[PDB]
Design a protein around this ligand. Sequence first.
Ligand SMILES: NCC[C@H](O)C[C@H](N)C(=O)O
Ligand SMILES: [Fe+3]
Length: 348
Amino acid sequence: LTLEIPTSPLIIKITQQERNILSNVGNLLVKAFGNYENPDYIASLHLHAFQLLPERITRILSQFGSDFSAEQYGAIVFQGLIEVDQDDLGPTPPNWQGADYGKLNKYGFICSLLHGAVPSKPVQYYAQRKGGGLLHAVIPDEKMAATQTGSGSKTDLFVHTEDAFLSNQADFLSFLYLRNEERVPSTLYSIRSHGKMNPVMKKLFEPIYQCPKDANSGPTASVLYGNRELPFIRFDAAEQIFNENAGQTSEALGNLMDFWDEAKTLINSDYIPNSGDLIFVNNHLCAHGRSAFIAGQRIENGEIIKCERRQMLRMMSKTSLIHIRSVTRTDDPYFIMEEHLGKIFDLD
Ligand SMILES: NCC[C@H](O)C[C@H](N)C(=O)O
Ligand SMILES: [Fe+3]
């Protein structure tokens, strides 16, 4: 019978036994490898992922990695993946630069294991903080309050797939919420929520769209690619549509406007992540964002509740080092040097 169109992500309630295993597995890996960027750990990542993760998590992620069917949302919420000791974590640093990665080391092991079970290899992009490592602290900055970045707060972060301007954008993403006391909803948008291929969607297969770099003669790409009936997406609502300098053709902007009108009714803002929740996303199916918020506060019965500022950890991964090899550093096949749709950063 009828197709069952996904409108929300799969919600997995992590158990106390699973939390405890992940903690003690994380603690063992820190003692064994020191840090999650250790080359000996990375080379044997999939082995540790499949051997050390709780069975149910491994099944969920293994199934998800190869699932591009009509019923797949392209996002999983792992509720209560970790217990965050808020007093040990201490105050949120002023910016991402202030993050203590010694503190976050266990979290980066746990996150890399989740990517390893897909299977997928964690990667870093020069397009993102000159690399910034395999794990990124996403903290609101007062200086970059009304910006279209993770460092943003005061404004809503319109739905986007990560790095729509790169031909070698992340395959999978994980967002580990350490703190979300402001109670900011995590917005998600799946191309699968559209259902069957329609004429509005078909126009997005044309490589007539500008994909500008993060907040004239640039190269163009297709918004939809992959299988013609069940496609993959590269989309940035703020950079491709709502940016004056997008440099779109009238035909291209119209097709993007027509698409946006359909897509915006499908955005899911129902999920407000709690501390210790992780959102695992297939970056080719599901776009992400987050609503506008005043960092360090929430409002209850018309009263301002001051709180600790939002703190989230982002990890990105690629399922094949082979494909991206032309754009990665010679001395590091996990470091992507791509700047814009095939073009590589010219440093000297
Ligand atoms: N559109 C991606 C932007 C990143 O989330 C944030 C950026 N690296 C920053 O934290 O300054
Ligand atoms: Fe993003």
